[PDB]
């Protein structure tokens, strides 16, 4: 069977490239970050603009939700992360210590920690309550494109333009595993699978790969899209059929069958690089967002 994602809403309002969209864990909201220095909150089901959250002095590259859906963290070119109370819109904490653009960020499931990756080639682990940087990992030798906690928070996966994917022990900060492949093309994105056993890694040779990271074996590859220049988010879609979902530099959203690797759908409508996609936690809904020549978020809905 194949999905039939259809366009439901186009969300306009950002005045520069959108950089990242994330659904709240409770399914109610979509958060978007933008080069226009703003976070915007939208209704996940009717597409209705809810609010604007502001305070970064430069554009934002990533945003992430706490498990209880009450907080956001954003990563900015202004070298800071900010922790935000969604209901009030207030900045609760400004996390300082990176020496270049902060690129990627995430909460752990407990949501007592934040992990960040930066152009300064480090991964930092931050205390949410106090805002203090707990650890600075000399993780990579080029900008860090993605950081993600596994399901119990005990592991972090990081990716970098240096061509490496690394698995880190959260508590000890030591590197547990380094994944290298072929001629080590830049790794533009990585994240754990929902069950925590796999990682999905994007490389700028137009390729996504599913890895058993402990065994160091590439189980799947997903190709056919265009990804040579940008750090594009990819996703496991698990609310219906088991798909892989990714944006693309040919302005399309691609959806693959996870097991067969075949493309099962291509979503048309954006007019610039689809830098970010996200999958709704309970419904067969995709959010997609695109760069400067587009500036919109689209919501798509499928029967499976």
């Amino acid at each position: 069977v194949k999905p039939n994602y259809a366009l439901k809403f186009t969300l306009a309002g950002h005045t520069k490239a959108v950089s990242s969209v994330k659904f709240s864990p409770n399914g109610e909201w979509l958060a978007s970050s933008s080069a226009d220095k703003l976070i915007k909150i939208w209704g996940a089901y009717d597409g209705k603009f809810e609010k604007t959250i502001s305070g970064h002095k430069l554009g934002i590259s990533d945003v992430a939700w706490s498990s209880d859906s009450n907080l956001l963290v954003s990563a900015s070119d202004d070298k800071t992360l900010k922790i935000w109370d969604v209901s009030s819109g207030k900045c609760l904490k400004t996390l300082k210590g990176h020496s270049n653009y902060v690129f990627c960020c995430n909460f752990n499931p407990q949501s007592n920690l934040i992990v960040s990756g930066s152009f300064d080639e480090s991964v930092r682990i931050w205390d949410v309550k106090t805002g203090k940087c707990l650890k600075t990992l000399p993780a990579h030798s080029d900008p860090v494109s993605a950081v993600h906690f596994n399901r119990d928070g005990s592991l972090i996966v990081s990716s970098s333009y240096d061509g490496l994917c690394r698995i880190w022990d959260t508590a000890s900060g030591q590197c547990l595993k380094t994944l290298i492949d072929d001629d080590n093309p830049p790794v533009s994105f990585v994240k754990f699978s929902p069950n925590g056993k796999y990682i999905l890694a994007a490389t700028l040779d137009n390729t996504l790969k599913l890895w058993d990271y402990s065994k160091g074996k590439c189980l799947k590859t997903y190709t056919g899209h265009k990804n040579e220049k940008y750090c594009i988010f990819a996703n496991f879609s698990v609310t219906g059929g088991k798909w892989i979902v990714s944006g693309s530099e040919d302005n399309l959203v691609y959806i693959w069958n996870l097991q067969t690797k075949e493309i099962v759908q291509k979503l048309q409508g954006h007019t610039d690089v689809v830098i970010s996609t996200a999958c709704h936690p309970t419904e067969n809904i995709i959010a997609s967002a695109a760069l400067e020549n587009d500036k919109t978020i689209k919501l798509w809905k499928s029967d499976c």
Binding site: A17, S19, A35, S61, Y101
Partner: peptide, 8 residues
């Protein structure tokens, strides 16, 4: 802008 929205 933002680093993610720039090529590299």
């Amino acid at each position: 802008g933002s680093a993610r929205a720039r090529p590299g």
